[PDB]
Ligand binder design. Structure first.
Ligand SMILES: [Cu+2]
Length: 105
């Protein structure tokens, strides 16, 4: 397995550039068995696991999951698309979201 720290050195924050997490995710292989870790300061950001449509429109309500205490560690147990957004303020709207596609171990 591999434990990915989302955003690397920038961690999970409000990006200056909307494509920042698209860039971070590019080229990486997310496999069943891998872990994602979102590091952030309590109350400044959070993590919501959401559907594709909620990702696309930054819909914060009624997510699949929602975590407010950092660090958020999520195991990738199934293959297919996974979407994450931060629901604090305008962060999602400016790019604080991540889309990945999990493949077999
Ligand atoms: Cu945020």
């Amino acid at each position: 397995m591999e434990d990915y720290d989302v955003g690397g050195d920038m961690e999970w924050k409000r990006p200056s550039d909307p494509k920042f997490y698209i860039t971070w995710a590019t080229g990486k292989t997310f496999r069943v068995g891998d872990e994602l870790e979102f590091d952030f300061a309590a109350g400044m950001h959070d993590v919501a696991v959401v559907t594709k449509d909620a990702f696309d429109n930054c819909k914060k309500e009624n997510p699949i999951s929602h975590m407010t205490t950092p660090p958020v560690k999520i195991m990738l147990n199934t293959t297919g698309p996974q979407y994450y957004i931060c629901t604090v303020g305008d962060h999602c709207r400016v790019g604080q979201k991540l889309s990945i596609n999990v493949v077999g171990a």
